[model samples]
Target chain A: MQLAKVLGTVVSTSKTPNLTGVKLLLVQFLDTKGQPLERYEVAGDVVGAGLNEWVLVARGSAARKERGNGDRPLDAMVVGIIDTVNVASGSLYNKR
Target chain B: MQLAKVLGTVVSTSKTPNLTGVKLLLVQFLDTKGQPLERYEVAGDVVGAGLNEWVLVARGSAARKERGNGDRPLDAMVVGIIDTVNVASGSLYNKR
Candidate 1:
């Protein structure tokens, strides 16, 4: 799992039929220092997170099983919404 | 789960047999400002995404279940193609 911040939403009518009701959100990865990575991802939302919210992104096969929807064509999913992230070095992010 | 752009394809004849028919693509992550990231990933294709197009990548276990085949060793998979991305702050991308 990795720490990410939700940036926004993505909309598309002509997507795979099974993904009709799935909510797609744009997210950027964060380093231990809390610096946002330049790389971003469009992940399916299982936790109903909002924009600017911190989330836990599960990758690979585990991502599909996050919400118990194992058949969906999902590579990344927001498994958990972070309330706060505290690293051993120091506090990286605290949700308001 | 993260926003990424299809850079090219990956060809490996010596891959796992379970991935025999899978189409592997090279993708680069993106930033909120739409800048490309330096880190990259090799993702399996489920939607026949083309080069230079924006896509949705599912990671972990869910990634292997995209096309309903759960016993694969894929860490990433392309789930959707981007049509447009809108944010409360403003519009980010519109596919032309």
Candidate 2:
């Protein structure tokens, strides 16, 4: 899972039947350094996560399997709420 | 499953009782090496993913336990489709 923050909300009235009653959220991508970038996009609402909240998002098949939807097609979801980020070297990669 | 591809498919019509009408697609992400990522995405398909196709996805913990109606939510979904990716030096340290 990666890191991100919910920045805003999006409403879509006309969509597929499966996406009928769901709300989309505008999320800003966060770099590995824990810095928020300006690039943003709307995503399907899985968790009722609000704006300005830091979240853990999983991508790819791990994302689907994480939600037990390995047979389904999914791209994104708010996996967890991040309480703290402790990067000692200010880097996510450690060359040993 | 972290690095994988949609090597197959599965179906469920009577799911959670709330998710009674939705089709799920299987997906996978590629690693920095351009090889198929073993992880996959079985998610709500906004983007149709066929077998042997690459995709990007997300996940969370908010998957509904038993078909929630306003009381339940989901944790994974298909958010985007990756057309091309260029990583530097067989590492994902930099991309623009």
Candidate 3:
């Protein structure tokens, strides 16, 4: 798992049968400095994350495996809502 | 998942039996400024994404699972059409 920020949401009204009811999010990896480093689309259960909120996104097939649901075509999920990110000398918090 | 530029496509005449008839492409990552950062290979339904298109790629075993094609051994997929990217106090769209 790594640090990420929920950039936005995705809606696919028509897609593969397996992906019919999955929730997709646009997530970007954040460096310790709180800057965007990488981004990818992930399938999830739709936790209703607000835009720009720091989140923790998982990677790999395990990401889906982690969900343990065979029905949802999920690839990535927002597992946690980050309340704070501590760096060497500074910190990134929801307040910041 | 990071932003990548579609450098080129790959044709593997002989590969793992699990990867038969799959389309692979050479993809690279892009920073917030839309510069190349990292690169990797991905398999998709081949949506005809042309060269120099800013694309969202999925990764990990879930990436393959997200496709939910048990017969297809895919680990990544380009699932969206990126229209814009919001940067800090700025915005990045799908244009040069």
Query: Chain A TM-score of each model, in the order shown?
Result: 0.90, 0.70, 0.75
lDDT of 1 by residue, A1-96 (tens): 888888889976656666878898888888877778865667789889998888988765566675456677766678999888777876778897
What TM-score does chain B of candidate 1 reach?
Answer: 0.92
Clashes counted in candidate 2 amount to: 27
Quick one: RMSD of model 2? 13.7
Assess each model's interface with DockQ, reporting 2 decimals per model.
Answer: 0.52, 0.04, 0.24
Ranking by DockQ: 1, 3, 2
> What are the RMSDs of all candidates, in order?
3.7, 13.7, 4.3
For candidate 1, lDDT tens digit of each residue in B1-96?
A: 666799999999987888898999999987678778786679898788998998776666656664455778888877778888887687898888
| Model 1 global lDDT (CA atoms, 0 to 1) | 0.79
lDDT of 2 by residue, B1-96 (tens): 133344333243213433335445444455756575434344554456555555555554432322332222344455555554556555442223
Q: By the TM-score metric, which is better: model 1 or model 2?
A: 1
- The model with the greatest lDDT is 1
Task: Please give, for residues A1-96, the per-residue lDDT of candidate 2 as tens digits.
Answer: 445689888786766665554466777877544467775546554556777876655454333543444544456655444445433333232212
Stretches > 4 Å off in candidate 2: A38-41, A66-73, A89-96, B1-96
TM-score of chain A taken by itself, candidate 2: 0.70
Question: What TM-score would each prediction reach against the true structure?
Answer: 0.72, 0.42, 0.66
* Native contact share for candidate 1: 0.79
Would candidate 2 be rated incorrect, acceptable, medium or high by CAPRI criteria?
incorrect
- Largest TM-score belongs to which candidate? 1
